[PDB]
Amino acid sequence: ARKFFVGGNWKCNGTAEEVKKIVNTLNEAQVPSQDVVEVVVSPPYVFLPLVKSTLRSDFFVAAQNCWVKKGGAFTGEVSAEMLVNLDIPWVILGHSERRAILNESSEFVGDKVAYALAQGLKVIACVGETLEEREAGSTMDVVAAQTKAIADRVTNWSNVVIAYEPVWAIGTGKVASPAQAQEVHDELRKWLAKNVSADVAATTRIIYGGSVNGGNCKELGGQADVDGFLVGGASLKPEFIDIIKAAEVK
Amino acid sequence: ARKFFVGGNWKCNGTAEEVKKIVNTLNEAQVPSQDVVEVVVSPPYVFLPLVKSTLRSDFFVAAQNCWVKKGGAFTGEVSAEMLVNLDIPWVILGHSERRAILNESSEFVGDKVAYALAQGLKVIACVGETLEEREAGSTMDVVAAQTKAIADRVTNWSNVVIAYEPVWAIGTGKVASPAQAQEVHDELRKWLAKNVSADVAATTRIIYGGSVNGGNCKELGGQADVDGFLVGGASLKPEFIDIIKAAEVK
């Protein structure tokens, strides 16, 4: 059975004082065991040392990005081997904001995933379609294309978690229903089964990366092919603890 | 008189063990006073806390990049206000590797410089032309266009240092002479005098960001319009100390 997975993407947010308050609140939380839910917290690069040194040892830390290949003359970038050196176990790759605002292509994302895995990182790999793409009836064409670019470069999926982001509902005034989330997760898992292997489809966590909050987390998490969440803004808030506790619905 | 300035850009390099060795070596160095030379060291984001906590207090730390505007939903990016919060005083912006590989436009760089200054950072702003551009006779056309994009957005130059990168000599098999460096620095300073102000031209450090090592630092540093260096690979090596010591040539 797939272990429920809850990741918290802090995005480009944080100060030393706020990080201290967030971590203290997480440290005082009483949540399901590590056998029931896998919890990953992702601060900006410059707060990885502070968070890794002060966060409860049963929660894990992720970087929000890394470079596509070995380090060297790439001013401003952080290599996967640096993260491994600092004992940062996870990385988020292919987030919708990086695909859209920083123009990361599906192929670029796939090369990053492959390189990160080869260095020993575990990866939250993000996919998702825009409002224009959904309206065009292209949701699964887009999500499959993004996933295929990764699948073409990755032979071993053990340390991958896929995050589906309904970008079409992100600040579009559209809201995503639990039924809509389940439809995409189900079709994506079917795609993995048909295009990678039955074993990979059965064992790979596919987590929901749309709007998740204390109010809707149990309803989303109870969906058959939803294995957890990649949380945005709520991950900065005490409400993240309630989202972790949604693992009990499984 | 303009204070000599030596920045060390570590680029995408470093491990905890190597950082400890580099910092120990700098900490044991005996170099000209803080009144004679201003020294800035720039590690990858994830080593900014380690370096800030262990480096001698009379040397300063820089980030290698920051985001173009206020933080928020920009997964993977580090905002200028984060760096200020962590007491990181400097940032490198517009480095040739980010212009070329990550496609940062001159306008994007200009906006970053303005935002960083607005938040209280000091900025090393990088400009420079390619081999194709130099061979076409466009060196000063290009450097002026890049500088204009920054100047059009900057209201106060006190906390700006300009770095000229002879990109045309970077892995092209061409070598830049000290005379060639001095020509560009002189023409760039004259451009500042005519198009910003005589005071800004007289007071703004323009540092050389081509190949600098122990062997050539004195000849370069002695040029009338060269105010120091943005060092690449030598910045990881004990030789960085000899480059700092070139300040004595002024």
Numbering used by the authors:
A (entry chain B), B (entry chain A): 2 to 251
Which text from the study accompanies this structure?
Triosephosphate isomerase (TPI) interconverts glyceraldehyde 3-phosphate (G3P) and dihydroxyacetone phosphate (DHAP). One or various cytoplasmic and chloroplast TPIs (cTPI and pdTPI), are present in plant genomes. cTPIs are involved in glycolysis, whereas chloroplast enzymes participate in the Calvin-Benson cycle. The three-dimensional structures of AtTPIs confirm that both enzymes assembled as dimers with asymmetric units containing two monomers that fold into a canonical (β-α)8 or TIM-barrel. In conclusion, our data indicate that the duplicated TPI gene from A. thaliana has suffered two evolutionary fates: the cTPI isoform is susceptible to redox agents, whereas the pdTPI isoform is resistant.
Crystal structures of cTPI and pdTPI were solved at 1.7 and 2.15 Å respectively. Residue cTPI-C13 presents an ASA of 2.6 and 2.8 Å2 for monomers A and B respectively, whereas residue C218 presents an ASA of 6.7 and 2.6 Å2 for monomers A and B respectively. DTNB conjugation indicates that cTPI presents 2 accessible cysteines suggesting that both cTPI-C218 and cTPI-C13 are possible targets of redox agents. We found that the addition of 1 mM of DA inhibited cTPI activity to less than 5% of the untreated level, a response also observed in yeast TPI. At a GSSG concentration of 0.87 mM, using cTPI at 0.184 μM (10 μg/ml), enzymatic activity decreased to ~70% with respect to the activity of the untreated cTPI and was completely inhibited at concentrations above 6.5 mM. As expected, the glutathionylation signal was absent on the cTPI-C13S/C218S double mutant, indicating that in cTPI only residues C13 and C218 are glutathionylated and are potential targets of glutathionylation in vivo. Residue cTPI-C218 is located on α-helix 7, distant from the active site and the dimer interface. cTPI-C218S mutant exhibits a decrease in activity by more than 140-fold in comparison to wild-type cTPI activity. From these loop 3 residues, the only interaction that is different between AtTPIs, is that in cTPI residue M83 makes a hydrophobic interaction with cTPI-C13, whereas in pdTPI residue Q83 makes a H-bond with pdTPI-C15. Residue cTPI-C218 is the most exposed cysteine in cTPI, in contrast pdTPI presents a serine at this position (pdTPI-S218). cTPI-C218 and pdTPI-S218 are surrounded by charged amino acids. However, cTPI-C218 is located before a lysine, whereas pdTPI-S218 is positioned before an alanine indicating that the epsilon amino group of cTPI-K219 may contribute to the reactivity of cTPI-C218.
